[PDB]
Design a protein around this ligand. Structure first.
Ligand SMILES: CC1=C(/C=C/C(C)=C/C=C/C(C)=C/C=C/C=C(C)/C=C/C=C(C)/C=C/C2=C(C)C(=O)CCC2(C)C)C(C)(C)CCC1
Ligand SMILES: N[C@@H](Cc1c[nH]c[nH+]1)C(=O)O
Ligand SMILES: [Cl-]
Length: 305
């Protein structure tokens, strides 16, 4: 067993690989087309999906960069936003690259508000997308909401130029007395239940003790994150205030055990308004420690167990 071979457990699991496909197509576009396409997607999605305000700490961390753009003339504002999309080497692009996903998302949330209000240079009136860009937007608009928000997040994360790391403060774990316990049809495995419950409580120090020293976590469409230091950093930087709603699973006992669970996850960016269809694929060692866990965004609800 290696981490890279563990990636192959439960090969029937059909991931929503239209998400990375669509990001690859998006990545080819002209920068002005990239910005305009996301503006159109975001405006249309906002007719039915309510996005949460960025956290106060996040907005403080992004404040100096946002102020710099706000002080620019309109041509320079457009150029700064194009620099980010083009992954140009500029001071702003390097600052942006140092930020956690949530800080990048909050930065663009604020620019979108300012563009709507007309205080930052908007997408030009009457703007027409390129041939390739129109088709990329059509693909996004045909996706389930959970896939759409994953495309937007990955587009945002990929901008800027790459190192110092800036992230939001780590919230205290949920008080013991108020914590929920999940139930999973077919799965009583204590490691899997404790995984779900500790993540739901933001209890990352308890969560990390479930792993082997060489264990890995593979987020959707990302390479495995290997070892307790890197996995705990990922938890603290990117995994706060999720709600995991596992539904059902299957347990296949080497003394190792493979377990697959399907259900839904909510991000604090959308709360109950977007339920992403998710699989968890666990490979546990004989002592019950996590050697490998993958989290997959599923192609459709038809992929739930
Ligand atoms: C750019 C841009 C603009 C603004 C864009 C904005 C503002 C977009 C905002 C998008 C947002 C806010 C998206 C949020 C997505 C969040 C997601 C998709 C979260 C998924 C999390 C998952 C699936 C976690 C699962 C996990 C589980 C379950 C585990 O068990 C272990 C941990 C982990 C793996 C993490 C404007 C309009 C100005 C136009 C110009 C360009
Ligand atoms: N950073 C943690 C590491 C840890 C080990 N187990 C749980 N957490 C600590 O200071 O203790
Ligand atoms: Cl999130």
């Amino acid at each position: 067993f290696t981490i890279d071979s563990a990636r192959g457990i439960f090969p029937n699991t059909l991931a929503a690989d239209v998400v990375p496909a669509t990001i690859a197509r998006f990545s080819q576009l002209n920068a002005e087309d990239q910005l305009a396409l996301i503006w159109f997607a975001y405006l249309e999605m906002g007719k039915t999906l309510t996005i949460a305000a960025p956290g106060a700490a996040s907005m403080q961390l992004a404040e100096n960069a946002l102020k710099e753009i706000q002080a620019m003339g309109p041509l320079q504002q457009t150029q700064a936003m194009c620099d980010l999309a083009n992954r140009a080497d500029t001071p702003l692009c390097r600052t942006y690259a140092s930020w956690s996903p949530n800080i990048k998302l909050g930065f663009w949330y604020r620019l979108g508000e300012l563009m709507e209000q007309g205080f930052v240079a908007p997408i030009p009136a009457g703007y027409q997308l390129s041939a390739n860009a129109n088709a990329v937007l059509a693909t996004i608009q045909g996706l389930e909401s959970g896939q759409q928000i994953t495309v937007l997040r990955n587009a945002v994360v990929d901008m800027g130029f790459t190192g110092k790391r800036i992230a939001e403060p780590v919230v205290p774990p949920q008080d013991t007395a108020s914590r929920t316990k999940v139930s999973i049809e077919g799965v009583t495995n204590a490691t899997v239940l404790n995984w779900m419950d500790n993540l739901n409580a933001n209890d990352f120090d308890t969560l990390i003790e479930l792993f082997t020293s060489d264990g890995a976590l593979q987020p959707p469409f990302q390479r495995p994150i290997v070892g307790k230091e890197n996995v705990l950093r990922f938890f603290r930087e990117e995994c706060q205030n999720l709600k995991l709603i596992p539904e059902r699973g299957v347990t296949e006992p080497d003394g190792f055990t493979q377990i697959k669970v399907t259900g839904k996850v909510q991000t604090p960016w959308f709360g109950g308004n977007v339920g992403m269809n998710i699989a968890w694929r666990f490979l546990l060692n004989p002592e019950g420690k996590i050697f490998f866990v993958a989290i997959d965004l599923l192609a459709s609800p038809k992929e739930l167990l």
